[PDB]
Design a protein around this ligand. Sequence first.
Ligand SMILES: NC(=O)c1ccc[n+]([C@@H]2O[C@H](COP(=O)([O-])OP(=O)(O)OC[C@H]3O[C@@H](n4cnc5c(N)ncnc54)[C@H](O)[C@@H]3O)[C@@H](O)[C@H]2O)c1
Ligand SMILES: NC(=O)c1ccc[n+]([C@@H]2O[C@H](COP(=O)([O-])OP(=O)(O)OC[C@H]3O[C@@H](n4cnc5c(N)ncnc54)[C@H](O)[C@@H]3O)[C@@H](O)[C@H]2O)c1
Ligand SMILES: NC(=O)c1ccc[n+]([C@@H]2O[C@H](COP(=O)([O-])OP(=O)(O)OC[C@H]3O[C@@H](n4cnc5c(N)ncnc54)[C@H](O)[C@@H]3O)[C@@H](O)[C@H]2O)c1
Ligand SMILES: NC(=O)c1ccc[n+]([C@@H]2O[C@H](COP(=O)([O-])OP(=O)(O)OC[C@H]3O[C@@H](n4cnc5c(N)ncnc54)[C@H](O)[C@@H]3O)[C@@H](O)[C@H]2O)c1
Ligand SMILES: [Mg+2]
Ligand SMILES: [Mg+2]
Lengths: 257, 257, 257, 257
Amino acid sequence: SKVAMVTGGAQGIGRGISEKLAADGFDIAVADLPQQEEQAAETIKLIEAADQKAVFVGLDVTDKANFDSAIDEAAEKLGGFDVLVNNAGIAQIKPLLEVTEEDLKQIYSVNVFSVFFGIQAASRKFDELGVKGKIINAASIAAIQGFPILSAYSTTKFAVRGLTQAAAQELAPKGHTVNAYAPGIVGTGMWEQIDAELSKINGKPIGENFKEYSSSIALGRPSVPEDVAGLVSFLASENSNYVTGQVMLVDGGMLYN
Amino acid sequence: SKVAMVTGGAQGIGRGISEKLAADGFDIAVADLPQQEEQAAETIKLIEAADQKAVFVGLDVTDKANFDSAIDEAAEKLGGFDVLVNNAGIAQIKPLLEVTEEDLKQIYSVNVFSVFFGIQAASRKFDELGVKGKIINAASIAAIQGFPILSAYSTTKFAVRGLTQAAAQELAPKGHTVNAYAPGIVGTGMWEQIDAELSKINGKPIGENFKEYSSSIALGRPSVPEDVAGLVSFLASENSNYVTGQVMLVDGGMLYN
Amino acid sequence: SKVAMVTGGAQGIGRGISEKLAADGFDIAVADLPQQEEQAAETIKLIEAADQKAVFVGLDVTDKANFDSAIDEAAEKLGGFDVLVNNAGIAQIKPLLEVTEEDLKQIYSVNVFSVFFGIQAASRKFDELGVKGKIINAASIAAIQGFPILSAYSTTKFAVRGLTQAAAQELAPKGHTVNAYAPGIVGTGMWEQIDAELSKINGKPIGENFKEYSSSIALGRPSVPEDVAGLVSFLASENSNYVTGQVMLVDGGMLYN
Amino acid sequence: SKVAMVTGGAQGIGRGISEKLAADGFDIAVADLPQQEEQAAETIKLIEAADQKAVFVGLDVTDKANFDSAIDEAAEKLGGFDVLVNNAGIAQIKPLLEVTEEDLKQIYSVNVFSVFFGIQAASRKFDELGVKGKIINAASIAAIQGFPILSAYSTTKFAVRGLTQAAAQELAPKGHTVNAYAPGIVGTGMWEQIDAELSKINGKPIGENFKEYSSSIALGRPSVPEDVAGLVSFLASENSNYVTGQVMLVDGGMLYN
Ligand SMILES: NC(=O)c1ccc[n+]([C@@H]2O[C@H](COP(=O)([O-])OP(=O)(O)OC[C@H]3O[C@@H](n4cnc5c(N)ncnc54)[C@H](O)[C@@H]3O)[C@@H](O)[C@H]2O)c1
Ligand SMILES: NC(=O)c1ccc[n+]([C@@H]2O[C@H](COP(=O)([O-])OP(=O)(O)OC[C@H]3O[C@@H](n4cnc5c(N)ncnc54)[C@H](O)[C@@H]3O)[C@@H](O)[C@H]2O)c1
Ligand SMILES: NC(=O)c1ccc[n+]([C@@H]2O[C@H](COP(=O)([O-])OP(=O)(O)OC[C@H]3O[C@@H](n4cnc5c(N)ncnc54)[C@H](O)[C@@H]3O)[C@@H](O)[C@H]2O)c1
Ligand SMILES: NC(=O)c1ccc[n+]([C@@H]2O[C@H](COP(=O)([O-])OP(=O)(O)OC[C@H]3O[C@@H](n4cnc5c(N)ncnc54)[C@H](O)[C@@H]3O)[C@@H](O)[C@H]2O)c1
Ligand SMILES: [Mg+2]
Ligand SMILES: [Mg+2]
């Protein structure tokens, strides 16, 4: 089977992607923080229910060395490495005038620097194994339009968008492709947090902010990991071999770029 | 089963899309100009070889009435109608200052008005059958960045881009999605034509223009109908359900949007 | 004195642009439909009040020959021709499924073919006069994001967007630049018509659709011609000499591209 | 007289902007590294030659505390504060696979974090003075399309693009606007550096990389500070009052977005 690593695969969009890629015939390397291993258990169970090989790989994407060994371990255990999905990331909700250098340093490390490290490690591995790989990064609608109150987060996603473009161009001659998926409003822990932090600011009751930000989706429904998985499935398959440097929206109809 | 109509399916990108969707398990209605029914023989041959039902449908996409009946016929012959691919289209190569009103009327009818007609007929057929359909339009890199000497063509593709966004939002409540594919340099009959005409204009030898316009492709190789077929496969599949109003580039890396 | 022709200058944005460019030192050729001369009386008044020459020129931008004669007349009566603002245009409001071929031919003629003709005529005159000119087209937020119910209109603006790009690249070697302005919701006769047609569709009282569509403008206020004139002033000035092929948003904060 | 602070105004585009704004009627605060004071003496001369007041303010934009005191000092010395131009920035030239965390921390601090700091300090001063202000950020064509070998730098500019959008929406209620200028290839000390570094990488002789990258400019020639100052002049004037959250390209025709 082909091998793909999904960072942040312990839960949310990461888990959904892992389950889907497994159904597509990929053996999966579920990479996420070491403390998230128990949480990853379910993700692992889903991969194995799809009749594929799964292994958890402890990783803090903010650390290059850890990312390099994380990918070596994954390739070793699964006997290959063909796709890297840089899904791991965090969100920050805070008025622009309140953002601190501390906030910035932290979110750029987890959301941007990590992608540089994952791209570099994926590249080394691909070449080492003598194969053409696929790198898939998690952008967002916030990478296409900056969102108020989520300025720090938005800027890191824009950075990911720009990185996807530059990296795809530098790795293209080697035959590797780099694309990104941009989901809309996905009811995961990230939004329970966003909605919770928004509530503390505007006073709207819990869950209410989620509904308002969701009221604009053309298809009239908030998203679930499966929706995002569908696009990532394409980005990992052979059908996307001629697509590179793009950031594709899977937002049910929110932005049209 | 699932039924899809591919206009301009008698050759080039249209044929490849028909063959791809056939492999995906779609019964195909190859819609093209009556004059191309013979040229379309091979296409129907490629479809039946993938063990799917294929029927030719005489259609001049510029004629609304013909498009309405064309879809009625396809839905009656194949027993259903789930996907429409507005692929039929033409190219014009001419310096801006030389473009005539007749050039404009001609190209806008085939490249733009036709997509409106197709979108309307498809939407009505989806509703009659009680199906949530997928409409896929043929955009192009020229729909993202206007190209000199191909201004008329570029403008129609930009129109398709805008139409794709507008139609997606308008048809979302019925559950229908509208997306587009934007290929780069695809070595089909259309580019033989483009290279030939550009040759007469700038004087460069035959084939040289084709190479010239291809020297920017990150992946380092021009495109074939198969490359585009890959994206359309995703757009016609269930994996793209939460994607709408988007114009996705399959250009090997030329524009990044 | 520097000379600028403003098509559709009898009222709305065209009138605002005329008055502004006059204030900037331009003599203005107010080009509009013959029956609009009386209406243009105010535009001309506003222009002459800035110690500048103003002349009404009968022009139906949908006719190539008339555009040529109009620019010739403007150049001869004002003694030069430095800037052409392709502002004339119309709006159509109608569900996508109701859009007829007649509607399409009409709106594309007025909003798109007209711009080709305008660009061609302006380019000729510039060269004839041995000067480098500025062509400024009227785009719209609808050229950046298609709007439902105004699908035909949106597609024409996207076409204008593409035309601006293609033309800028094609005319650059001659030193001419082609840019466009993209206003948001401006209270003119065009929005009176849009609001009125929307009202017929959703039953909202007159003025409410305008208010609703304007409720999300970041700067918290609908637009007036003067706002747009601000950008066009830049685009007609020496300050924009190194800007070309761009579609610039002056929408108070609606779309960000 | 109105007051504007131009960071990195000791030379290059910053100097060009300071001179232009001075010419438009603004008193200028030239903010740059203390070591650049002597260098800035040239900028100060160009400003005073316009019969406008000028002062140098020692500022390392990466230091938030320093940025707050610099704006205080600026507003106090010039008796006002209406415009802030976040122009200070650096470039890095290095293959993606070689980018280090040290490079990233470095370039993001100077190119992105500083902008957050400037916006915050500007906003606070604007409100303190009870005025509506304009914030203008230095983006780049690299903020619109990521460039190979300039990945780190590109990603920072994309972040600035996102920041400009998010800040615009967040500060709009107060009446402040935030926009950005995106220069193309400007022959300043920065490109001297980029060319020199590119030279060591691809072996091309000195100066050839500058020409190579410039070859594609529609208007046929590289840019000078004044080309950029033209757009900034618009961005600092009342003509841009209804424009916000935009990143406008002044690249002579390289990217069209
Ligand atoms: N939820 C949404 O609506 C939405 C919209 C757009 C984009 N995204 C993006 O999709 C991705 C997944 O988001 P989600 O909703 O599933 O989030 P989530 O919080 O549910 O899951 C994120 C996972 O990332 C892991 N992680 C965090 N920091 C890490 C680090 N330093 N090293 C390794 N693993 C780390 C977490 O342990 C967690 O399992 C993110 O990049 C997010 O920005 C989400
Ligand atoms: N070839 C490329 O490099 C390229 C790049 C981008 C986009 N496209 C788009 O993809 C589509 C297919 O292009 P292609 O290369 O396969 O072209 P092609 O010339 O090989 O095929 C075009 C098909 O369109 C049919 N057709 C033309 N006018 C028609 C009409 N009025 N009614 C019905 N059928 C009609 C023709 O019979 C023909 O089979 C077009 O819309 C084109 O704009 C092509
Ligand atoms: N009103 C808005 O909110 C808005 C937003 C974006 C873009 N625009 C664009 O700005 C431009 C001006 O719009 P407006 O609000 O001032 O409209 P308007 O209806 O107030 O003015 C349009 C002018 O165009 C002239 N005109 C129409 N058809 C013509 C033809 N065939 N030949 C010559 N002149 C013709 C009319 O006589 C009229 O004076 C249009 O291109 C429009 O699409 C308007
Ligand atoms: N040169 C180009 O072609 C080009 C194209 C697009 C965008 N830009 C952008 O325009 C801006 C100006 O570039 P340039 O060509 O004038 O560069 P430059 O090197 O000529 O000038 C940059 C100035 O920034 C100052 N500076 C650097 N770090 C600083 C810090 N931490 N604190 C305070 N001041 C600091 C320097 O002292 C210097 O005077 C940058 O943001 C750059 O990214 C340049
Ligand atoms: Mg697929
Ligand atoms: Mg100006």
